[PDB]
């Protein structure tokens, strides 16, 4: 069903994160994780206390598609087990986000096409700088649109709201 998800996207925030490689995105699903520059490591932490769910949507540059989405379950911590990201120095990014997977499918733009992001000058959802966030409505129809992930049960992230 699509009722749970309704309810964990309810008055929820969107930022769209974009990755350079399909590397780091495999491992912020396999490890429940993410790290990004701190210009957008504070305005993830600020987006945390701020709403009942922050989702980050998941694009990697190039390849045509959003590779699934996430909620964040803490702010940015630093002292973890270093994440062998694959960059361009590790110095450079903030702290470690953990995260909650809410779908791991793919959703290719062709999808999104009819949707536009008030935020972004109404460009397609698909267009923007890591970390752009995307406004509610845009943001809710974009992750119902990403084929129902079966593997994920959302009884455990419905309580840590
Ligand atoms: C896992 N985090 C990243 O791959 C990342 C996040 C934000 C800015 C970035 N610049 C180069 C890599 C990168």
């Given at each position: 069903?699509?009722?749970?998800?309704?309810?964990?996207?309810?008055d929820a925030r969107f930022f769209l994160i974009k990755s350079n490689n399909h590397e780091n995105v495999s491992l912020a699903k396999a490890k429940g994780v993410w790290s990004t520059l701190p210009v957008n490591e504070k305005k993830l932490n600020l987006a945390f206390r701020s709403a009942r769910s922050v989702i980050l949507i998941f694009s990697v540059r190039e390849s045509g598609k959003f590779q699934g989405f996430a909620?964040?379950?803490?702010?940015?911590?630093?002292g973890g087990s270093p994440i062998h990201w694959v960059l361009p120095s590790a110095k450079?990014?903030?702290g470690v986000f953990k995260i909650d997977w809410i779908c791991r499918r793919e959703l290719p733009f062709t999808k999104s096409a009819h949707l536009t992001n008030p935020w972004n000058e109404h460009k397609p959802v698909k267009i923007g700088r890591d970390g752009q966030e995307i406004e509610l409505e845009c943001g809710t129809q974009l992750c119902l649109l990403f084929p129902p992930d079966e593997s994920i049960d959302l009884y455990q992230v419905i309580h840590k709201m």
């Open positions: 069903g699509t009722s749970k998800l309704k309810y964990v996207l309810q909620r964040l379950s803490s702010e940015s911590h630093h450079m990014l903030g």
